[PDB]
């Protein structure tokens, strides 16, 4: 349903992550065709107060004047709606609703905002969700059976009690091949080759002595998964595997390119 | 003086900007300024306007402005974030000429370092790669899951002189080969330990 | 092993493939001559002391003649290798220049008194090395581990 250019996603994460928690805000720009398919191309970072920002961020001269400026040498069409930048927890909007819900119909019903999370999303899967005006009207969309993943939110009572008003739908994504593609020696005996095969073979010596002690010891009188893998005195044997792995990616490969 | 780092924030911004100006005609060196922290190695982290580029179509001897518009977006992003200073400016790929060095010089106003050349490094995207690693789906990063100068070029080429160097090269290879032989052994042993673990496991599951 | 029953390039890899299946098999015929015959051929290529005599007490299967010819080459003179050959004469496996080859590996020094005596590019003599000389042996064990993977394909 709701679409994004994902430049709005990166400027979104930029403005959010830059200003935590401070709940930074802004408002994006796009176009409407039907019920709720909203292409969002650019988010507009409206400025920050001291520590608590509200409807006062809806300024005359900043969004009006700069909407004229990047209307001229940039994004031409009308705005969509706002956003909000929840740090930490996730998505529920208690004091946010009185500062956001009444603002929409001043413009249009074709107006969404979105709460994001640049703290708990360290991921490559960032928490994004728009919503509705279900302040009132408890009075269609076959969806293939209610869309799936909003019968799986973090089902928490204050969140789901917020979801009575909220009703998120989807977040689509676009990108192009160009952008995709874009994003996608030596050292020899300085001291290097010696002093990382003079090092690691010594831990292979006495760590293989402790591997000897491990195989001698656990051979008999062993039960219950070696007392839960020796959480204590970690860790024999695997250490040897790791050591073996470290040199054979190094003492060959760039040495190979030496040839 | 250090090099440049990168943030693909400005890369997606300029790429979307040439998705903007790509109407009928107008293959244009669209110059827009950057704002961000400038110090030792940086990127000038965020883009700006352009005052879009048109000369005649190729007669590139006439300019774009305002300096008050420089401090429109650069001035009123200070109301949003105050960490920034202009150095960076871009244009299209890949051709440059005296127009571009004349906007380095003529429209200078700070810009000591701004190549979009020794400052040549295309960065890491610190602390905001969450908006990159979500944007690195189908086909993935690797796959994830998988005359004077040229006169001085060949001054440092010739080496077949194997007496000394050859012997040395032979030797090092031998020593490192040995290391690998030593290793490729203890992982074979611990692999065999996993074999007897699996065989006694399924042997007891009989 | 029956393929092991001329060339010497692969008799030892078919000796490794041969000396596998005999926990307790026979007392004549199949179990006996594979080991002692194949290590005799392993001296027909020329492999001397340090796998020979302490590996003997596993079999001890009548154990006179072939071991006697192994030390008759380990010393390497025709004078008492004669009585290993002619005085025994029934040892069988009938199918001389190799025990000549052992003593002349030494020389007196190198040339041996202006190219003439009897006993009876890496300027070093062949010690070790860090180039092509030792590389061959190196890639031996690497190959072994790679061939030992087969282990992971068995559960």
């Amino acid at each position: 349903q709701v679409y994004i250019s994902s430049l709005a996603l990166l400027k979104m994460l930029k403005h959010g992550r830059a200003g935590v928690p401070m709940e930074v805000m802004g408002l994006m720009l796009g176009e409407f065709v039907d019920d709720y398919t909203v292409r969002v191309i650019d988010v507009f970072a409206m400025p920050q107060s001291g520590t608590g920002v509200s409807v006062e961020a809806v300024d005359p001269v900043f969004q009006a004047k700069m909407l004229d400026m990047l209307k001229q040498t940039g994004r031409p069409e009308m705005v969509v709606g706002w956003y909000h930048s929840h740090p930490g927890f996730g998505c529920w909007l208690s004091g946010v609703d009185i500062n956001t819900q009444q603002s929409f119909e001043a413009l249009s019903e074709r107006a969404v905002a979105v709460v994001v999370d640049p703290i708990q999303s360290v991921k490559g899967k960032v928490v994004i969700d728009a919503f509705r005006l279900i302040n009132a009207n408890m009075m269609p969309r076959q969806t293939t059976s209610n869309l799936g993943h909003l019968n799986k939110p973090s089902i928490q009572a204050l969140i789901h009690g917020l979801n009575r008003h909220y009703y998120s739908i989807t977040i689509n994504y676009r990108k192009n091949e160009l952008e995709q593609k874009m994003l996608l020696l030596t050292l020899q005996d300085y001291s290097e080759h010696c002093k990382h095969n003079e090092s690691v073979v010594k831990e292979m010596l006495e760590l293989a002595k402790n591997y000897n002690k491990a195989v001698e010891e656990e051979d008999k009188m062993t039960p219950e998964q070696l007392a839960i893998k020796n959480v204590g005195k970690q860790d024999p044997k695997r250490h040897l595997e790791e050591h073996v792995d470290v040199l054979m990616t190094s003492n060959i490969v760039q040495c190979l390119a030496a040839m | 003086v250090q090099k440049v780092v990168v943030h693909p924030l400005v890369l997606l911004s300029v790429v979307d900007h040439f998705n903007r100006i790509g109407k009928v005609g107008n293959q244009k060196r669209v110059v827009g300024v950057l704002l961000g922290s400038w110090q030792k190695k940086v990127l000038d982290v965020s883009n700006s306007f352009a005052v879009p580029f048109d000369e005649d179509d190729k007669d590139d001897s006439v300019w774009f402005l305002d300096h008050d518009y420089l401090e429109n977006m650069y001035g009123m992003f200070k109301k949003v974030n105050a960490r920034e200073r202009i150095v960076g400016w871009y244009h299209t790929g890949p051709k440059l000429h005296k127009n571009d060095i004349a906007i380095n010089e003529l429209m200078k106003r700070y810009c000591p370092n701004s190549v979009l050349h020794v400052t040549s490094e295309i960065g890491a995207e610190e602390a905001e790669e969450v908006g990159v690693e979500h944007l690195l789906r189908d086909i993935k990063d690797t796959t994830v899951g998988t005359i004077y100068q040229l006169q001085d070029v060949f001054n440092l080429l010739p080496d077949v002189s194997l007496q000394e160097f050859v012997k040395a090269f032979y030797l090092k290879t031998n020593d490192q080969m040995v290391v690998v032989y030593l290793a490729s052994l203890i992982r074979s042993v611990v692999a065999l330990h996993n074999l007897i673990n699996n065989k006694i496991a399924n042997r007891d599951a009989e | 092993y029956y393929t092991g029953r001329l060339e010497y390039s692969e008799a030892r890899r078919t000796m490794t493939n041969a000396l596998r299946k005999a926990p307790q098999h026979t007392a004549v015929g199949f179990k006996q001559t594979v080991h002692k015959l194949l290590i005799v051929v392993e001296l027909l290529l020329g492999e001397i002391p340090d796998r020979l005599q302490f590996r003997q007490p596993s079999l001890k299967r009548s154990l006179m003649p072939y071991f006697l010819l192994t030390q008759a080459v380990r010393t390497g003179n025709l004078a008492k290798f004669n009585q290993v050959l002619d005085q025994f004469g029934e040892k069988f496996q009938a199918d001389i220049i190799r025990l000549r080859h052992n003593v002349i590996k030494t020389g007196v020094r190198m040339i041996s008194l202006s190219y003439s005596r009897i006993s009876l590019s890496k300027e070093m003599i062949d010690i070790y090395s860090t180039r092509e000389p030792q590389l061959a042996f190196h890639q031996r064990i690497s190959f072994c581990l790679d061939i030992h993977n087969m282990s992971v394909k068995a559960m």
Partner: peptide, 8 residues
């Protein structure tokens, strides 16, 4: 030995 130089 670049041809000669299974581990993965």
């Amino acid at each position: 030995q670049v041809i000669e130089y299974m581990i993965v």
